[PDB]
Write a protein that binds this ligand. Structure first.
Ligand code: POV
Ligand code: POV
Lengths: 368, 368
């Protein structure tokens, strides 16, 4: 059951699926020419998934180095790692636009071209949220460093939730490019100037200035989530009011609801403060868990199937829950690292098995 | 979804099902004549389910009165309620044998004749375990008063688990009649003599004498559970090694495993001692939960279907878990009573809806 996570009929609907998108906003038309200009120099024999993997690897490595120099969020790393992580984010966005575009150039358009960008994009969402939240030094306001970061997951889920009830990705007037440019702006601003300026309050209203960008982000989240939820509650494609697989429209929200609710409990209950001594492992552990859950919803909307709550990676956070349901029976930092290891292996094994099965069933190499 | 817990195809397999049993042991042949002798005086127009309900009502009322005079298990009720509860147990056993036998007399043999005795028998198992454990005053050894009582559930489940992989009830050389006569013996012994004799240790080995009957019961549990598990792990009927519905043989054990594991956690974690101030509400709450779970397995083995972990009555104990996962946020006795109310209503609603649907689909009255 490990090496065959899909059935033959699921492979048939995946072969039947066709990709579609209906998203135009403000910041793309200045960037389309730039993306094409970086595109033509790339040789045509390079596989698209190689581009995706290169971007994800660069972003993960740079954000891991930045996490290494700042495991918490109350101290400043040297500016060179801020600039390097910003360049990693920019090259990641460039390679994602390139992979979406240059892959179409060969009849490579295939469904492993997605069920990938939507896995690599999930991982990059988690890592980018952690990196942006560190660079702004949100450890002085730990609640935000939690809440904002998990909003950075939830919006993503809503976007794919939208697709699950429409079969086509609707972007909206403010979307991924705006966040990505805003985050490279905050990265280069915390790089060129000292990060201590984020502690400089405004004399107008005595606000710490770490609150203004996060409330701008929160307001944009309100716009995008209203735009998503309108068609979540008013888009019925597969039936009179249901989703593209016939499942009730409110079913996929249970997954991200359970993840966020578990995060709330393990935040609030912890007698030993796991955050104020070691964050960014907690958010990475829910990052791997949310990565598998979002990958499952990706598979669900491009292959018409019902969502399933039963997953093995909920053994990751759930372990913490058990070790918090008792007294600390094992030291919480050690069980958190164990949850890291078990969730990371289960996510990686699931994702590699999925790509291997998709490649073997279609008799196509992962790299062409 | 409340008023139709079954599908049309499930009703079809229930109509297809036929009852079978292969159990003969020591204590039945002296009792068969007695049961028939009490049987012939009963008029033929009385419905079998009326007999089942009368027995269950008498047992529940008597055990509830005995619980009322001893909410804990460290004090003695007057002897008249001991004798009354013993007579209730005996008349319950008599009416169960009568309902199994005299119902066959009309083409009443129907499948609502079971999917009842196996619901009323589950309720009676829980109530009888609580009554026997009170009458022996197991509050001085609370662990036993827990553990033994939950063994009194688990064996029952194993029996039906046996049926789930063989389609026919195998009793064994020691079975329900032995327990029932032993419990009416312990009831009349604690009635005629003072219950304080259960505190009289034996000078031979300094044993409290509440340990000897519970270890005899435990040994008999070992015999019966080995007899069940041999065909659990070596009976394959519907497939090469699977169950009568094709489901893996170890799947139904997860339900009773989860119930017992939740009971273990809420026992051990409780900072405020729920037991030493108010037991017999805790065991009754897991009694209603285990009653619904065992009723579901009854439906599963006489109507070929897969077991489902998702049930609403796990909101009952689970609530305690949540109120224990935090600090006591609400006083534990009050949330335990709330769990009582919610689990009792969900179990009663499920069971009455099930019987109503079975009656309406077959166009047969519940009483004939
Ligand atoms: C920050 C300033 C605020 C002002 C503006 C507010 C804006 C927010 C408003 C509204 C939000 C709208 C978001 C919708 C996202 C869609 C999800 C999705 O699947 O798309 C993509 C995933 O997307 C990603 O790769 C990144 C996900 C971003 C969320 C994490 C940010 C949280 C960090 C917060 C930390 C802050 C720390 C404190 C602050 C210093 C999928 O990729 P694709 O579709 O295949 O790409 C091809 C399409 N293309 C060709 C167009 C490229
Ligand atoms: C106690 C002395 C120990 C010595 C002997 C050890 C013996 C134990 C050994 C082995 C155990 C074997 C048990 C198997 C039961 C089968 C389950 C089942 O579905 O059958 C029946 C349910 O059964 C019931 O109604 C009652 C269930 C009894 C369990 C609760 C007792 C715990 C109390 C412990 C508290 C102790 C306190 C401390 C002690 C003072 C279903 O009913 P039926 O099949 O439809 O009926 C018709 C068939 N008939 C015609 C045959 C009637």
């Amino acid at each position: 059951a490990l090496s065959e996570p899909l059935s033959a009929a699921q492979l048939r609907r995946l072969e039947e699926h066709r990709y579609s998108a209906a998203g135009v906003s403000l910041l793309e038309p200045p960037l389309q020419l730039y993306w094409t200009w970086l595109l033509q120099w790339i040789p045509l024999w390079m596989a698209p998934n190689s581009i995706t993997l290169l971007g994800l690897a660069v972003n993960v490595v740079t954000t891991l180095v930045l996490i290494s120099y700042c495991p918490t969020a109350t101290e400043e790393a040297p500016y060179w790692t801020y600039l390097l992580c910003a360049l990693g984010l920019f090259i990641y966005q460039s390679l994602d636009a390139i992979d979406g575009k240059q892959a179409r150039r060969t009849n490579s358009c295939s469904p492993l071209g997605e069920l990938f960008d939507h896995g690599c994009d999930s991982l990059s969402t988690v890592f980018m949220a952690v990196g942006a939240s560190i660079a702004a030094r949100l450890g002085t306001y730990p609640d935000w460093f939690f809440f904002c970061s998990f909003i950075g997951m939830f919006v993503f889920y809503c976007a794919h939730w939208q697709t699950y009830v429409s079969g086509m990705l609707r972007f909206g007037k403010v979307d991924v490019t705006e966040i990505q440019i805003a985050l490279v702006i905050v990265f280069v601003l915390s790089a060129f100037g000292g990060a201590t300026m984020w502690d400089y309050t405004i004399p107008i209203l005595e606000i710490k200035l770490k609150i203004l960008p996060v409330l701008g982000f929160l307001g944009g989240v309100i716009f995008s989530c209203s735009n998503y939820f309108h068609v979540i509650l008013h888009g019925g494609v597969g039936k009179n009011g249901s989703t593209i697989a016939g499942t009730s429209v409110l079913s996929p929200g249970l997954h991200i609801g359970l993840i966020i609710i578990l995060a709330i409990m393990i935040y609030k209950k912890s007698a030993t403060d796991v955050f104020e001594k070691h964050p960014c492992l907690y958010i990475l552990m829910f990052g791997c868990v949310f990565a598998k859950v979002s990958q499952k919803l990706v598979v669900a909307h491009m292959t018409k199937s019902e969502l399933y709550l039963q997953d093995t990676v909920f053994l990751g956070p759930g372990l913490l829950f058990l070790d918090q349901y008792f007294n600390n029976f094992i030291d919480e930092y050690v069980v958190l690292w164990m949850a890291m290891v078990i969730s990371s292996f289960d996510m990686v094994i699931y994702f590699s098995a999925l790509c291997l099965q998709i490649s073997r069933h279609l008799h196509l190499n992962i790299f062409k």
